């Protein structure tokens, strides 16, 4: 536990930093025409890069016990920036999923509806909305120092804040999750329908459906448990009933935390392995 978490955290930090740096070097210098998914990929890589740069500054708390000897200012900034990146990750993933759905299932009305400038302004707007949604995180976090810096904690909430958090979670995770599930299931159904016919080279499409299934399974196993556990926490808090369970939920979020970081850090690896184009770009840039 006290040693299980720091080692996984630092391994995730190392692998994420290396993968994001390699991706940056690969798709930063490249000759040709700009793609539509490339800007989404670079935005996701940039979001996940700062998702864990301050992570080594956070493992000190979980190293021995709530240690924050680095300073006092960095706690608020780190909490805000990892909260902003957490908000950015799922929204960027669902934007990518809906873009893929529009580009594959309906390449008749989405052929001209999606544009490079439109995608850029969507990225700017989504970054801005995530930044404004992360504002309560910045003001909430503060130091205590009551018992020689126990931990960098905050008051739980007010019932209005419980309602606000529940609404925000519903609008930022649940709706994107159902959108991702629906878009990917429709894409898989279309691919299976094209695959079942007696073709000649139709059997080479196993890669695409395999990638879809792997991405969906990884997202479901990583992001869902944290969100549903915390949703149970708010719904129990607002119920006021005797349904006040033990730290079984509290242990739930703490273990599920590293799961999200694992999904964030393994994202470049699946792009490097189960994809072309960037695969050759990485080896061309690395030399």
């Amino acid at each position: 536990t006290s040693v299980f978490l720091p080692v996984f955290y630092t391994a995730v930090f190392l692998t994420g930093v290396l993968g994001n740096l390699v991706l940056m070097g690969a798709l930063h210098f490249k000759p040709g025409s700009r793609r539509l998914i490339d800007i989404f990929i670079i935005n996701l890589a940039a979001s996940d890069f700062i998702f864990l740069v301050t992570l080594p500054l956070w493992v000190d708390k979980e190293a021995s016990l709530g240690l924050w000897r680095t300073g006092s200012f960095l706690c608020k900034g780190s909490s805000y920036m990892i909260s902003v990146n957490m908000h950015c990750s799922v929204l960027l993933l669902t934007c990518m999923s809906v873009d893929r759905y529009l580009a594959i299932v309906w390449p008749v009305v989405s052929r001209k509806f999606r544009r490079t400038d439109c995608a850029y302004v969507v990225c700017a707007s989504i970054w801005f909305i995530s930044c404004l949604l992360g504002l309560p995180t910045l003001l909430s976090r503060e130091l205590t120092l009551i018992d020689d810096k126990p931990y960098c904690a905050e008051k739980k909430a007010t019932p209005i804040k419980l309602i606000w958090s529940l609404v925000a979670l519903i609008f930022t995770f649940f709706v994107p999750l159902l959108s991702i599930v629906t878009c990917y299931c429709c894409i898989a159904r279309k691919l299976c329908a094209h695959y079942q016919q007696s073709g000649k080279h139709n059997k080479k499409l196993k890669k695409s459906i395999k990638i879809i299934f792997i991405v969906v399974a990884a997202f479901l196993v990583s992001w869902l448990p944290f969100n549903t556990f915390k949703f149970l926490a708010i719904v129990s808090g607002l119920r006021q009933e005797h349904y006040l369970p033990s730290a079984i939920l509290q242990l739930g979020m703490e273990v599920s935390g590293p799961l999200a970081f694992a999904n964030s850090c393994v994202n470049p690896f699946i792009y490097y392995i189960f994809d072309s184009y960037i695969r050759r770009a990485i080896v061309h840039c690395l030399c």
Binding site: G66, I82, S83, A153, E154, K156, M253, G257, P258
Partner: peptide, 14 residues
């Protein structure tokens, strides 16, 4: 309870 200063931990809590 507010004086207990519950620790969220890593990702933002409720």
């Amino acid at each position: 309870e507010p004086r207990l200063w519950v620790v969220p931990g890593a990702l933002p809590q409720v």
